[PDB]
């Protein structure tokens, strides 16, 4: 409302309002948590055989 009253350029304020308030971007992905958790499980298994040997 404030930027529509200030900017007298017709079409531009509703254009930016539509292209900005309906703008969505996703979270940047990982593809590493699966590796970290699998390496966690592997070192836990090696730590468990170390456990039973101790």
């Amino acid at each position: 409302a404030y930027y529509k009253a200030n900017v007298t350029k017709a079409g531009l304020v509703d254009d930016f309002e539509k292209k900005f308030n309906a703008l969505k971007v996703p979270i940047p992905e990982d593809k590493y948590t699966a590796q970290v958790d699998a390496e966690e499980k592997e070192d836990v298994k090696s730590c468990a055989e170390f456990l039973i040997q101790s």
Partner: peptide, 14 residues
């Protein structure tokens, strides 16, 4: 003056 860009999609790689 119209149709603004958003960003360039970077990738955090640790």
């Amino acid at each position: 003056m119209n149709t603004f860009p958003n960003f360039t999609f970077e990738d955090p790689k640790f």
